[PDB]
Design an enzyme around this catalytic site. Structure first.
Site, short mmCIF file in Angstrom:
data_model
loop_
_atom_site.label_atom_id
_atom_site.label_comp_id
_atom_site.label_asym_id
_atom_site.label_seq_id
_atom_site.Cartn_x
_atom_site.Cartn_y
_atom_site.Cartn_z
N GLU A 153 18.81 45.28 -18.17
CA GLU A 153 20.25 45.04 -18.22
C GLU A 153 20.95 45.59 -16.98
OE1 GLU A 153 22.01 42.95 -21.72
OE2 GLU A 153 22.30 43.27 -19.57
N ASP A 154 20.59 45.02 -15.83
CA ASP A 154 21.31 45.25 -14.58
C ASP A 154 21.17 46.69 -14.11
OD1 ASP A 154 22.22 42.56 -14.91
OD2 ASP A 154 23.87 43.30 -16.15
N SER A 155 19.92 47.15 -14.03
CA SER A 155 19.61 48.49 -13.57
C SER A 155 18.39 48.40 -12.67
CB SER A 155 19.37 49.44 -14.74
OG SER A 155 19.09 50.74 -14.28
#
Ligand SMILES: [Mg+2]
Ligand SMILES: [Zn+2]
Ligand SMILES: [Zn+2]
Ligand SMILES: [Zn+2]
Ligand SMILES: [Zn+2]
Lengths: 206, 67, 46, 51, 404, 1131, 115
Positions: free
Chosen positions: F759-761
Site C-alpha cells: 500500500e504505497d510504501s
RNA sequence: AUCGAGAGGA
C-alpha cells in the site's frame, strides 16, 4: 572552512577503508576495553591537517589521513588506484580534524562491511527449479553453467538438493578476500560456540 | 555535492575514481569505456560514476568566510 | 570576552564590544559572522 | 461539537505485517509523552512504585 | 487506544487498538485494517487517542475494538479483508500445483499462532513428502466453518456440465470442517464481500478467532511469498506479435468503420433514430464503433496473457487492477471523454490546431489508439490529460458537497 | 538545403537550445518589469493631470521626466551605497531603487509676470527592483562576477526582495479588454448578452464594461437593451444611438445592419425601433439617459450634461474619449449590436469564456503599473492638500516637503510583502495571492513558481468549466502541472517555449494601414461595409479594407522581416466573418513555431549550421526570428493556423490529410512545463500520475541553489549526494536539472518482500543509507532583533543571569557567549537557547525574552550572522544544521507519481540479491503499478539498466519514435541481462532463489520534504488557549489534536458515551460554575470564605455546582452578551 | 528521535538472557528456544542442521518482528530424544562443519597462492 | 502572542 559541513566530512571519513588485516584480531571492542574513551588496545588514532594556500584547488584525499599505527592506514594510501577524495579546498580553506577508528562489523554500520559485493549463486542450470522461468529460452546463461547452447535449463532433478555454491567475495580493501572468508568462518564458529555455552548454562540451570 | 566514497549498493569504493574518470573522458574515452577502465563492472557502480554531478566545483567559486 | 567577528566582505578578524554599531573597521561592511567555537563537538562517522 | 483534546498523538502511518489486526505499533516517544493515570492498590503497589 | 483517520466517514474510521511499543517514529498498522480507515502509506498520518479512565477503557475494549469491527452494519459484510500482497499470494498459494517441502512447511507453521503443534499428513507421501498450499491454509482456517465460493476465473458453463464437483481449473472454492477441500482463494473468498470465509468465520466463530484468522493468513502467506515472490515489469506489459497484429487490425477496421459513418453523415445517407437528433445519432454510432474496438482489443490482450503474467496475477486475485487496466497497458487506452462526450471543439471547429476543421474522426476527437507501453502521441497525450483533469476536478469538487 | 528526417531530431533541439540561450525560463517576468520601468512609470507620471492650485498667484506643478537610479541603500549617516541583493537578503532590506521625478513649477500671478522653476530629480519614491532585470545590479554580470557577489549563476531572478523576503509576482488571468464577447446565460432575463470590457490604451481608470443584451422571449418581439456604466437601468440601443446624434432610423440601421438585403436582421432589430419612437432627438434621448440614471437631476439641463459626459467618457473608452468621436462610438456600438444579432440569428457561435485567446496574463509589469497609478494619484492628492494649505495663506511652499515619498515606497513595499494587491486601507477589497514568497525548496520549485499563472475564479467556486484543461492551453500551459487540492485547474504553469507578450503601441501599424489602402471609419459610407473586411486594432474598429488576403500577406511579411510590426503582434484573419483583428497589447500568451512554405519548412540546413556555431558567429535565436523562419503565434492566431506536429506531416502521403500546413511544431514535448519536463516517458503514464509528479518534483530534495552556504533561509533542505538521472529528457538541459538535480538513481526492485512495502510504501537498504544514500542536511534560520523603541523598555542581546532576569526558563544558558549569541559548531538540543535577549522592565529591571530552538530539533549551529536592520538596531540570524538520515516514515517518490513512505530498512545481508551480489537500494510493491498504469516507471527502470550498463544517459523525451521498449530490451539483452529487466534474486534471509524473477534496475528516486520527524507529535496536558481553555493548535504550540464533529458522530454511532464525554469534556476543557437554582444564571461563588450568592435573586443558599465545559460557559456568557438568558435549570 | 542504536541488534541488554528454553505444552517433547540478539544468520543454520537429525520431528525458526532482535526456534524430537539435546548436537555439528570448512579453505588458499 | 493571508499534506 571547507564547503562541506562537519557531519559530511565525518560520514565521509567513516567510509574510508583502513587496512585491518592483522590488527583487527588484536584490537578489542571499546565495549570490552577496560580503558577510558580510547586507548591503543581498542582504537587507532588518525590526524588530518590540510590548508589550501596555493591558487589551485587542494584535493584533501585519504593520503592526508595520518595514523599513529603504521599497520592501520587507508587502503589507497597503502603501497595505480588514486586516493579517496575527502574534500576539495579553495585557497584560504582549511580542514583540521582528529579521528579515532574502532572495531566493528556490518551489522552496526555499513562502513564496517569489508565486502565490495558478494556474488553468491547455486544450481546455475535451473535443475532444482527453485526458479520457474516463464520463457527459459529468454534468459542468459550463468558463468558457471554447463549446458550446450540449445539447452536453456537443466532437466528437472526431483531428488536434488542445493549443493555446490559459487562465491565471488570482492574486498573493499580493509581485509584480503581470503582473510574475509577465513574471518567469516571463524566469526560464525564463535557465534555458535558462545550460543552453545549459553545453552549449556540454561540446560544445567534447569 | 562530491563523489561518494562507496557505492550505495555494494559498498565498492568509488571516491578515488572521479578524477581518473574525468581524465579518461578528456582522453576521448566513451563513458562506458572509461567506466570499464576503472573496473566498475556492476551497473550500480557505473550508476555512481555516470550519474554524479560535481557540485563542489561550483561551491568553490565562492570566496571562503576567512582569508 | 572579546567576541571577535569576521567581515562578510573583507574577511577581517575584528573585535567588537556590546552596545557598538556592527561595522567592520577595515571596510565598513555591515554584516559580520561569528567564528567557530572552541568547544569540542564529537561526530560518530555514521 | 468538536474541540482540541489532551492525550492525543499524530504521526505518519507505516505498514507492519507482524502486528495483529487489533494492534497498533506506537513509537516510544509518543508513549513516553502520553500517560495513563492508574490508581494505586495493594494489587499494583509494587509495580507502580517501580514505575 | 482509539486510532482514527480523517475524514472520519463511518464508525470504522475510529477503532480500538492494543498498543505495541516499537522502535521508530511512525504508527505501525496491520494491512487488513487499512481498508476500514481508507488508509495507505503514501504519507498518511493518523490520530491516536488514549482513554484516561478504566470506564472509557472498558467502553472501547467492549465496543470499538477492531475484531468487534470486522463486520459493518452498513452492508452486513466484512469491512476489512485480505489485501494486496497477501491476496495475490494466497491466490498463488492455493493453486493446485503448489507443493511445499518439509522444511518450508515447518517454516510456515512457525507463523501460525493457532497451531496445535501437529504436522498434518502430507498430501503426497511418495516419491517425496509434499504438502499443498490448500493443506496449510486448512490449518489457517479456524473452527469447522463450511463455505462455498467461486474463483473469479470460474467459467460460467462449468456448473452445468460434468466436473461440477471436480473442477478442472481448481475454481469453485469448497471449505468443509475448516479444511480447504478445493479451490483457489481470492477476493471473492477472503475479501470484504458477503458470505466470504472471513465473514463466515466472524459469524460462526467469534471475533477473537476471526482476528487470529486474519493475522495467521497474513503471516503465513507473507512468509511463503518470501519463497514464491511477486513482481511486475515490462515483460508483463508486452504481448506477442500475433496479439499486436490483431489489435492493430481491430483498430484499423474500427477507424475505417468510423470513416464510413462519417461519409454517410456527410452525404445525408444517415437518418436519425427515435429520441435523438442527427448529431447525437452520429455520435452514438461513432462511440459504439470505438467502444466495440476498445473491448475487442482488450479481449485480444486479455487472451494473450500467460499464466505467469503478473498483471493477470494481481487482477485474478483481486488484489489490484482490472481487466480494463491491462487493456490500456497492452492494447489501447481508448476514448478520452470530457463531460461524457468526446473531446470538444475548443478551437473553431477543431480540437487542436493540428487537425482540419470539421474532423469527427476518432483521432481528432480524442481516441487514443496507442497503449501505455506503446506511448501516446502528442495529441493523444493532451486529450488524455484533458480526460484525467476531468477526474481530478471531480475528485476535488465532489468532496465539499458530499461532506455537506 | 532541406533538413532531412535523420537530422531533424538534432536540428529541432538545436533550435530549442538557441531559444533557451536567448530567453531563459523567467523571460516573461523580466520583460514585464523592464517594460514597466522603461515605459509604464513614465506614461503614468505624464498621464496624471497638472495640479493647478490658486487662492492671485497660481501653480501648475507639471511632472515631465522620471529617473530611476540603480538600487542603493542609505545608512544612518546617510551615505548612499550600492546595495547588493545578497546584502538585502541578509540584512532584511528591500532591494529597491530611488525614483526621482523632474517637476516644473511656474509662477503666474498677473501682468505676464511668468517665471518657471524646475526641480530636477525630485525624489518621488522607492521602487522595488526585480532581480536580473535591466535595472538590477546583477544585470549583465558574468558567472564569475555573480560568484564574486555570492550569487548563484543559475539563479534565474525574476523576483523581488522585500524586507529580505524573496517575493514572486504570480501572473493573474483576466478576460481580454476591448473585445466584444457574446454569451448566453441560461438563468437570466436576457437571452443573449454581448459584453465589452473597454479600457483606454494607456490605462487610467478601471475597465468600463458595457453590455448590449436581448430580452428573453416572454412584449411582441425581442427587445435589445444596453446596460451602460454608471446607470442603474437598462437603456434601449436606439436611445443610445440618438443620444450620440443619430436620430434617423435609417442612420442607426446603417450603423447596425451593413447588408440591407437581409430581412432577418431587420425584423430582429425592429422591436427596438418600435420601442423607441417617442424619443426622436438627441437632447430628449440624453435626458432619458440621465433620468434612467441613479442620479436623476430635477432639471433636464444637468441630466443632459451628465448623459453627455457618460456617453463621452465611460461608454467605450477604447474607441476614444475625446469629443467628436460619436461616429466611431456609434459604429462600434452598432458592431456590438450586429454581433449580438448574429449570435441570436445563429450566424455566429457564442464566444467561449475559457478560450485563452479571450484571456490575458497580468504580469509583474502591468500589475505594478496598477499599483503605481493608484499610489501616484494618492501622492498628487497629498501634494494638492499640502500646497493648498500654504497658498491659502498667500505664500510660497517647498514641493520637497509637499512630496511625502512614503506613499509610493510603503505602498509598493506593503503590496509586494503581503500579497494583498491594492491599497493598505482597503485590505478586504484587495485581492490576495499575488506576490507570494518564492519557493526555494528545490530548483524546479523555484522555476515553476516563477512561471506560475493564476486564474482568480475563486477556489470556493465548484463549477468545473474554468478548471478544465481547455483545448487552447496547448503549447501555452503545461497539461500536467497543476495542484491536486482545491485549486485544480485554476493555478497553472507556462509551457517551456511559452512567451507572454509584453505589449506594444499600435501607432506604426495604424500609420502603415493609413499609408496602405485601408479606409478610415469616419470617411467611409456604411454601404461599403457589406463586402469589405473590418479591421480592428487592439479592439478598436479603425477602418475597412477590400482585399483582406493580400493585406494579411503584407502584414505577415512585415512581421517576419522585423519591420514596423514587432514579433509579438498577433494578426488574426477571421475569414467567414470578415474581421481582421490585430493585437499589440500585453498579456497575450504565445509560442514560437516554424513557418511552412508550400509544403516545406523555411528552416533550412544553413540555419542549423549557423546555430551549431552559436558561440562563435553570434547567430542567435533572434536571427532565426528575423530570418522569417520562426514566428510567435498567440492562442487567438492559432485558430487560423494549420500546424504540423513534425516535418513528417509535411511529406506527401498516399492520402493527404491537409497538404496546406502553415506552421510546424519545434517539438511537441514543449507543451510541458518545468516540472512535467522532468518526467521520463510521461506519455506512458496515466495523466494523473504526471500531475502528481509535477506537484511532487517541487517537494523533492536536491540543491535548491548553488549559493546555499550564504543564504539564511528559514527552511532549507540540501541532499548530500544529488545525482543527475540516468534516464533523462532533452528538456532538462534547459531546466538546469543536470546542474542542480533533486534525486538519486536507486537500484529499485519491484517485488513483494516481507510485506513492508504494501500500500504505497518502500523497503530501503539500511546499508545504502549508511553510505549516504538519500541523506540530507536541514538548515533552519532563526532571526532576532533587540529593539530600542523607547526609553520605557529596551531589548538587548546579553547572556541572561538568574539574579536579574524574571521570565528565565530552567534551561541552561551556558552555550551562549557574553554577547548573548551562541557560537557556531555548538551542538544544541530541543528547548535550548541560541540567543539570550533581555528586555528592561518598567528578577528586577530586566526580563528574559530569549530565543529558544524550535522544540525537538537537535541540530548544530551552522553559523551566526550579526548586522543592522533598516532602522539600525542589532540584528542576528542563526542557522542551525541538522542531518536528516532517511528512516521509517520518510516520504520518497519516483518521477511517475509513485510516492510512498519507508516501511522498513533492511541491511545488505537481509535484502534480496542477484547472482552478482547487487541488492536493491529500494524495494517497491508491484501492486502500485497496475491500477496506476505508470508504465513510464518500468520503461525508465529498463532504460536506466541499459544506460548504466552502456555508459550513457537514456533519452526519455516524451514523443520519440526512435526509442521504444523493444529497442531498449534488445539493447539490454546485449549486456547479459534478461531483455525485459528481470533477474533471478535470492532470499537474503535464507539464500534460496525466489521463484518469481524480479524486475530490478536503476530508477531516479526523490526524497521529499515530508520527513516523519517533522510530523510526529504527541500531547498529554500541555498548554491551553486563553479564550477557551482548550489545547493549543499545532505541533509548534504543543497543541492537541482536534476531536471534530465527525469524530463525535463516529463515537455516537459506536455508542461510546463515556469516551465521548472524556474527549469532548474531560480531555479538553473541564470547568465548574455555580448556578442559582431560581434564575439558572451563573452565580458568584467565594470558595475561600464559602459565600455563594446570586445578585439577581438576592439569595445565598440555593446555589448549585455544575460541571460543564469551559467552552459552554463561554458560549452562555457570549449569549448573555447578546441579551439572551440561557438559564441552566438543575430541576 | 526514535532511532535505536545500531548495536542493539547485536548486544545483550543487562539482565537479558542470550537463550531461554520454554517447554511447549501443545505436543510432547517440544521446546521453544528464544535467542536474543540473533537473526536469520544463526536461526537458518540451526534449523537446517536440526532437520538433518532423524530424531527431530519439527525444526523451525522465526524472527517475530524485524524491528525486534530475537529469534524463536521450535524443536520437537522423538520421545527417546530431547529438543535440548537436539539443539546441542546441531550446534556441535555446525561447529565441526565450519572448522572443517575453515581448514579446507586454508588449504585451498595455500594451494592457490603456491600453485 | 494574536490575527489574517499564502503555500502545502492526506
Ligand atoms: Mg494516503
Ligand atoms: Zn580502549
Ligand atoms: Zn556498486
Ligand atoms: Zn570589512
Ligand atoms: Zn438567582
Amino acid at each position: 572552512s571547507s564547503v562541506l559541513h562537519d557531519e559530511f566530512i565525518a560520514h565521509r571519513l567513516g567510509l574510508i577503508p583502513l587496512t585491518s588485516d592483522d590488527i583487527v584480531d588484536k584490537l578489542q571492542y571499546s565495549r570490552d576495553c577496560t580503558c577510558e574513551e580510547f586507548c591503543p588496545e581498542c582504537s587507532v588514532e588518525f590526524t588530518l591537517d590540510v590548508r589550501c594556500n596555493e591558487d589551485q584547488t587542494r584535493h584533501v584525499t585519504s593520503r592526508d589521513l595520518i595514523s599513529n599505527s603504521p599497520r592501520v592506514i587507508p587502503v589507497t594510501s597503502r603501497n595505480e588506484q588514486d586516493d579517496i577524495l575527502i574534500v576539495k579546498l579553495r585557497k584560504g580553506q582549511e580542514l583540521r580534524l582528529r579521528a579515532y577508528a574502532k572495531k566493528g562489523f556490518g551489522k552496526e554500520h555499513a562502513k564496517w562491511n569489508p565486502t565490495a559485493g558478494v556474488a553468491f549463486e547455486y544450481d546455475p542450470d535451473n535443475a532444482l527449479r527453485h526458479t520457474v522461468y516463464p520463457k527459459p529460452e529468454e534468459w542468459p546463461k550463468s558463468e558457471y553453467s554447463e549446458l550446450d547452447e540449445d539447452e536453456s535449463q537443466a532437466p528437472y532433478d526431483p531428488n536434488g538438493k542445493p549443493e555446490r555454491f559459487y562465491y565471488n567475495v570482492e574486498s573493499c580493501g580493509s581485509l584480503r578476500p581470503e582473510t574475509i572468508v577465513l574471518s567469516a568462518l571463524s566469526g560464525l564458529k564463535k557465534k555458535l560456540s558462545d550460543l552453545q555455552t549459553q545453552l549449556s548454562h540454561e540446560i544445567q540451570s534447569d | 555535492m562530491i563523489i561518494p566514497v562507496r557505492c550505495f549498493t555494494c559498498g565498492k569504493i568509488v571516491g578515488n575514481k572521479w578524477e581518473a574518470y574525468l581524465g579518461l573522458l578528456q582522453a576521448e574515452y566513451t563513458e562506458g569505456d572509461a567506466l570499464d577502465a576503472l573496473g566498475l563492472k556492476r551497473y550500480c557502480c557505473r550508476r555512481m560514476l555516470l550519474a554524479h554531478v560535481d557540485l563542489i566545483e561550483k561551491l568553490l567559486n565562492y570566496a571562503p568566510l576567512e582569508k | 570576552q572579546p567576541m571577535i567577528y569576521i567581515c562578510g566582505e573583507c574577511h577581517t578578524e575584528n573585535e567588537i564590544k556590546s552596545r557598538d554599531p556592527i561595522r567592520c573597521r577595515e571596510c565598513g561592511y555591515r554584516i559580520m559572522y561569528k567564528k567557530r567555537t572552541k568547544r569540542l563537538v564529537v561526530f560518530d562517522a555514521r | 461539537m468538536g474541540k482540541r483534546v489532551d492525550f492525543s498523538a499524530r504521526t505518519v502511518i507505516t505498514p507492519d505485517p507482524n502486528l495483529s489486526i487489533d494492534q497498533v505499533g506506537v513509537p516510544r516517544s509518543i508513549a513516553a509523552n502520553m500517560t495513563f493515570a492508574e490508581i494505586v492498590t495493594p494489587f499494583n503497589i509494587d509495580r507502580l512504585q517501580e514505575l | 487506544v482509539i486510532f482514527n483517520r480523517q475524514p472520519t466517514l463511518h464508525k470504522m474510521s475510529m477503532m480500538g487498538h492494543r498498543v505495541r511499543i516499537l522502535p521508530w517514529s511512525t504508527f505501525r498498522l496491520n494491512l487488513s485494517v487499512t481498508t476500514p480507515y481508507n488508509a495507505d502509506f503514501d504519507g498518511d498520518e493518523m490520530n491516536l487517542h488514549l482513554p484516561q479512565s478504566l470506564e472509557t477503557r472498558a467502553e472501547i475494549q467492549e465496543l470499538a475494538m477492531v475484531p468487534r469491527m470486522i463486520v459493518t452494519p452498513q452492508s452486513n459484510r466484512p469491512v476489512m479483508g485480505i489485501v494486496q500482497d497477501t491476496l495475490t499470494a494466497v491466490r498463488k498459494f492455493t493453486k493446485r500445483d503448489v507443493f511445499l517441502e518439509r522444511g518450508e512447511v515447518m517454516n510456515l507453521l512457525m507463523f501460525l499462532s493457532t497451531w496445535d503443534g501437529k504436522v498434518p499428513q502430507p498430501a503426497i507421501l511418495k516419491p517425496r513428502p509434499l504438502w499443498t498450499g490448500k493443506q496449510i491454509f486448512s490449518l489457517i482456517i479456524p473452527g469447522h466453518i463450511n463455505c462455498i465460493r467461486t474463483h473469479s476465473t470460474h467459467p460460467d458453463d462449468e456448473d452445468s456440465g460434468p466436473y461440477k464437483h471436480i473442477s478442472p481449473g481448481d475454481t469453485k472454492v469448497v471449505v468443509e470442517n475448516g479444511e480447504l477441500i478445493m479451490g483457489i482463494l481470492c477476493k471473492k473468498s477472503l475479501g470484504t464481500s458477503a458470505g466470504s470465509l472471513v465473514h463466515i468465520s466472524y459469524l460462526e466463530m467469534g471475533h477473537d478467532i476471526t482476528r487470529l484468522f486474519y493475522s495467521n493468513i497474513q503471516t503465513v502467506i507473507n512468509n511463503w511469498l518470501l519463497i514464491e515472490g511477486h513482481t511486475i515489469g515490462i515483460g508483463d506489459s508486452i504481448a506477442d506479435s500475433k496479439t499486436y497484429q490483431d489489435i492493430q487490425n481491430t483498430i484499423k477496421k474500427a477507424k475505417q468503420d468510423v470513416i464510413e459513418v462519417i461519409e454517410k453523415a456527410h452525404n445525408n445517407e444517415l437518418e436519425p433514430t427515435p429520441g435523438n437528433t442527427l448529431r447525437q445519432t452520429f455520435e452514438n454510432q461513432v462511440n459504439r464503433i470505438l467502444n466495440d474496438a476498445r473491448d475487442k482489443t482488450g479481449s485480444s490482450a486479455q487472451k494473450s496473457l500467460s499464466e505467469y503474467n503478473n498483471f493477470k496475477s494481481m487482477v485474478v486475485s483481486g488484489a489490484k487492477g482490472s481487466k480494463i487496466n491491462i487493456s490500456q497497458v497492452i492494447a489501447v487506452v481508448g476514448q478520452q471523454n470530457v463531460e461524457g462526450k468526446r473531446i470538444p471543439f475548443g478551437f473553431k471547429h477543431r480540437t487542436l490546431p493540428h487537425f482540419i476543421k470539421d474532423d469527427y474522426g476518432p483521432e481528432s476527437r480524442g481516441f487514443v489508439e496507442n497503449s501505455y507501453l506503446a506511448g501516446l502521441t502528442p495529441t493523444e497525450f493532451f486529450f488524455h490529460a484533458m480526460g484525467g483533469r476531468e477526474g481530478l476536478i471531480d475528485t476535488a469538487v465532489k468532496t465539499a458537497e458530499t461532506g455537506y | 538545403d532541406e533538413i532531412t528526417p535523420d537530422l531533424w531530431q538534432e536540428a529541432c533541439w538545436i533550435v530549442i537550445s538557441s531559444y533557451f540561450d536567448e530567453k531563459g525560463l523567467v523571460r516573461q517576468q523580466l520583460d514585464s518589469f523592464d517594460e514597466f520601468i522603461q515605459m509604464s512609470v513614465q506614461r503614468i507620471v505624464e498621464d496624471a493631470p497638472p495640479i493647478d492650485l490658486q487662492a492671485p498667484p497660481r501653480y501648475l506643478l507639471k511632472f515631465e521626466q522620471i529617473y530611476l537610479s540603480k538600487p542603493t541603500h542609505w545608512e544612518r549617516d546617510g551615505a548612499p551605497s550600492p546595495m547588493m541583493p545578497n546584502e538585502a537578503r541578509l540584512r532584511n532590506l528591500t532591494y529597491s531603487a530611488p525614483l526621482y521625478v523632474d517637476i516644473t513649477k511656474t509662477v503666474i500671478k498677473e501682468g505676464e509676470e511668468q517665471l518657471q522653476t524646475q526641480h530636477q530629480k525630485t525624489f518621488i519614491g522607492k521602487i522595488p527592483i526585480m532581480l536580473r532585470s535591466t535595472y538590477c545590479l546583477l544585470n549583465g554580470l558574468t558567472d564569475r562576477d555573480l560568484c564574486e557577489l555570492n550569487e548563484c549563476p543559475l539563479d534565474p531572478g525574476g523576483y523581488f526582495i522585500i524586507n529580505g523576503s524573496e517575493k514572486v509576482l504570480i501572473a493573474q488571468e483576466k478576460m481580454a479588454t476591448n473585445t466584444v464577447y457574446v454569451f448566453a446565460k441560461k438563468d437570466s432575463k436576457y437571452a443573449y448578452t454581448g459584453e465589452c470590457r473597454s479600457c483606454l490604451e494607456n490605462s487610467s481608470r478601471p475597465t468600463s464594461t458595457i453590455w448590449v443584451s436581448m430580452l428573453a422571449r416572454g412584449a411582441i418581439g425581442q427587445r435589445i437593451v444596453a446596460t451602460l456604466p454608471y446607470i442603474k437601468q437598462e437603456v434601449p440601443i436606439i436611445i443610445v444611438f440618438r443620444a450620440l446624434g443619430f436620430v434617423s432610423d435609417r442612420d442607426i440601421l446603417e450603423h447596425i445592419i451593413y447588408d440591407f438585403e437581409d430581412p432577418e436582421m431587420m425584423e430582429m432589430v425592429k422591436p427596438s425601433l418600435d420601442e423607441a419612437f417617442v424619443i426622436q432627438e438627441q437632447n430628449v434621448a440624453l435626458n432619458f439617459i440621465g433620468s434612467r440614471g441613479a442620479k436623476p437631476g430635477v432639471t433636464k439641463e444637468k441630466r443632459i450634461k451628465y448623459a453627455k459626459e457618460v456617453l463621452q467618457k465611460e461608454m467605450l473608452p477604447h474607441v476614444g474619449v475625446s469629443d467628436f468621436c460619436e461616429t466611431k462610438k456609434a459604429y462600434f456600438l452598432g458592431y456590438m449590436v450586429h454581433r449580438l444579432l448574429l449570435a441570436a440569428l445563429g450566424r455566429r457561435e457564442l464566444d467561449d469564456r475559457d478560450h485563452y485567446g479571450n484571456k490575458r496574463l497580468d504580469l509583474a509589469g502591468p500589475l505594478l503599473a496598477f499599483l503605481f497609478r493608484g499610489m501616484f494619484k494618492n501622492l498628487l492628492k497629498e501634494v494638492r492638500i499640502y500646497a493648498q494649505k500654504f497658498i491659502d495663506r498667500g505664500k510660497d511652499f517647498n514641493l520637497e516637503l509637499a512630496i511625502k515619498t512614503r506613499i509610493i515606497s510603503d505602498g509598493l513595499k506593503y503590496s509586494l510583502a503581503t500579497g494583498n494587491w491594492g491599497d493598505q486601507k482597503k485590505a478586504h477589497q484587495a485581492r490576495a495571492g499575488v506576490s507570494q514568497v518564492l519557493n526555494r525548496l528545490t530548483f524546479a520549485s523555484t522555476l515553476s513558481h516563477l512561471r506560475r499563472l493564476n486564474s482568480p475564479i475563486g477556489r470556493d467556486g465548484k463549477l468545473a468549466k474554468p478548471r478544465q484543461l481547455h483545448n487552447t492551453l496547448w503549447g501555452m500551459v503545461c497539461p500536467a502541472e497543476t495542484p491536486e487540492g482545491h485549486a485544480v485547474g485554476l493555478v497553472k504553469n507556462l509551457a517551456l517555449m511559452a512567451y507572454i507578450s509584453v505589449g506594444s503601441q499600435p501607432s506604426p501599424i495604424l500609420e502603415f494601414l493609413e499609408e496602405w489602402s485601408m479606409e478610415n471609419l469616419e470617411e467611409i459610407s456604411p454601404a461599403a461595409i457589406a463586402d469589405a473586411t473590418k479591421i480592428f486594432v487592439n479592439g478598436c474598429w479603425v477602418g475597412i479594407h477590400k482585399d483582406p488576403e493580400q493585406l494579411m500577406n503584407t502584414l505577415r511579411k512585415l512581421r517576419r522581416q522585423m519591420d514596423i510590426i514587432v514579433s509579438e503582434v498577433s494578426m488574426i484573419r477571421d475569414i467567414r466573418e470578415r474581421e481582421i483583428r490585430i493585437y499589440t497589447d500585453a498579456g497575450r500568451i504565445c509560442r514560437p513555431l516554424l513557418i511552412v512554405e508550400k509544403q516545406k519548412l523555411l528552416l533550412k540546413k544553413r540555419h542549423i549550421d549557423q546555430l551549431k556555431e552559436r558561440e562563435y558567429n553570434n547567430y542567435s535565436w533572434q536571427d532565426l526570428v528575423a530570418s522569417g523562419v520562426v514566428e510567435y503565434i498567440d492562442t487567438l492566431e492559432e485558430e487560423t493556423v494549420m500546424l504540423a506536429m513534425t516535418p513528417d506531416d509535411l511529406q506527401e502521403k498516399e492520402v493527404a490529410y491537409c497538404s496546406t500546413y502553415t506552421h510546424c511544431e519545434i517539438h511537441p514535448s514543449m507543451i510541458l512545463g518545468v516540472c512535467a519536463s522532468i518526467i521520463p516517458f510521461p506519455d506512458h503514464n496515466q495523466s494523473p500520475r504526471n500531475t502528481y509528479q509535477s506537484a511532487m518534483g517541487k517537494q523533492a530534495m536536491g540543491v535548491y541553489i548553488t549559493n546555499f552556504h550564504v543564504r539564511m533561509d528559514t527552511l532549507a533542505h540540501v541532499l548530500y549526494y544529488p545525482q543527475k538521472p540516468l534516464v533523462t529528457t532533452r528538456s532538462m538541459e534547459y531546466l538546469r536539472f543536470r546542474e542542480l538535480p533533486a534525486g538519486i538513481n536507486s537500484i529499485v526492485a519491484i517485488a513483494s518482500y516481507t510485506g513492508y512495502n504494501q500500500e504505497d510504501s518502500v523497503i530501503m537498504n539500511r546499508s545504502a543509507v549508511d553510505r549516504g544514500f538519500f541523506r540530507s542536511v536541514f538548515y533552519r534560520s532563526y532571526k532576532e532583533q533587540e529593539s530600542k523603541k523607547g526609553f520605557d523598555q529596551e531589548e538587548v542581546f546579553e547572556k541572561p543571569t538568574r539574579e536579574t532576569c524574571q521570565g528565565m526558563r530552567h534551561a541552561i544558558y551556558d552555550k551562549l557567549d557574553d554577547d548573548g549569541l551562541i557560537a557556531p559548531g555548538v551542538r544544541v538540543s530541543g528547548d535550548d537557547v541560541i540567543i539570550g535577549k533581555t528586555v528592561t522592565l518598567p528578577r528586577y529591571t530586566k526580563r528574559d525574552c530569549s530565543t529558544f530552538l524550535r522544540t525537538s530539533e537537535t541540530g548544530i549551529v551552522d553559523q551566526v550572522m550579526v548586522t543592522l536592520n533598516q532602522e539600525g538596531y542589532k540584528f542576528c540570524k542563526i542557522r542551525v544544521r541538522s542531518v536528516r538520515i532517511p528512516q521509517i516514515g520518510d516520504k520518497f517518490a519516483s518521477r511517475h507519481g509513485q510516492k510512498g513512505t519507508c516501511g522498513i530498512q533492511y541491511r545488505q545481508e537481509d535484502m534480496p540479491f542477484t547472482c552478482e551480489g547487487i541488492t536493491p537500494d529500494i524495494i517497491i510493491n508491484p501492486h502500485a503499478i497496475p491500477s496506476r498504469m505508470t508504465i513510464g516507471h518500468l520503461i525508465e527502470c529498463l532504460q536506466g539498466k541499459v544506460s548504466a550498463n552502456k555508459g550513457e544517459i537514456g533519452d526519455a523525451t516524451p514523443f520519440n519514435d526512435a526509442v521504444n521498449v523493444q529497442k531498449i530490451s534488445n539493447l539490454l539483452s546485449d549486456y547479459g541481462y534478461h531483455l525485459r529487466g528481470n533477474e533471478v534474486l535470492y532470499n537474503g534471509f535464507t539464500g534460496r532463489k525466489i521463484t518469481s524473477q524480479i524486475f530490478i534496475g536503476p530508477t531516479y528516486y526523490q526524497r521529499l520534504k515530508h520527513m516523519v520527524d517533522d510530523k510526529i507529535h504527541s500531547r498529554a496536558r500541555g498548554p491551553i488557549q486563553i479564550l477557551n481553555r482548550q489545547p493549543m493548535e499545532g505541533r509548534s504550540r504543543d497543541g492537541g489534536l482536534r476531536f471534530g464533529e465527525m469524530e463525535r458522530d463516529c463515537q455516537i454511532a459506536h455508542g461510546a458515551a463515556q469516551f465521548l464525554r472524556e474527549r469532548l469534556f474531560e480531555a479538553s476543557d473541564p470547568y465548574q460554575v455555580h448556578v442559582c437554582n431560581l434564575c439558572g444564571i451563573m452565580a458568584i461563588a467565594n470558595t475561600r470564605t464559602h459565600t455563594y450568592e446570586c445578585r439577581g435573586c438576592r439569595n445565598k443558599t440555593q446555589i448549585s455546582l455544575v460541571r460543564m465545559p469551559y467552552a459552554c460557559k463561554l458560549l452562555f456568557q457570549e449569549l448573555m452578551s447578546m441579551s439572551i438568558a440561557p438559564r441552566m435549570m438543575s430541576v | 528521535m526514535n532511532a535505536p542504536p545500531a548495536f542493539e541488534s547485536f548486544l545483550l541488554f543487562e539482565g537479558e538472557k542470550k537463550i531461554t528454553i520454554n517447554k511447549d505444552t501443545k505436543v510432547p517433547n517440544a521446546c521453544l528456544f528464544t535467542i536474543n540478539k540473533e537473526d536469520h544468520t544463526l536461526g537458518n543454520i540451526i534449523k537446517s542442521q536440526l532437520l538433518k537429525d532423524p530424531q527431530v520431528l519439527f525444526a523451525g525458526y522465526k524472527v517475530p518482528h524485524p524491528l525486534e532482535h530475537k529469534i524463536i526456534i521450535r524443536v520437537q524430537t522423538t520421545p527417546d530424544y530431547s529438543p535440548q539435546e537436539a539443539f546441542t548436537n546441531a550446534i556441535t555439528d555446525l561447529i565441526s562443519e565450519l572448522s572443517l570448512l575453515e581448514e579446507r579453505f586454508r588449504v585451498a588458499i595455500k594451494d592457490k597462492q603456491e600453485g
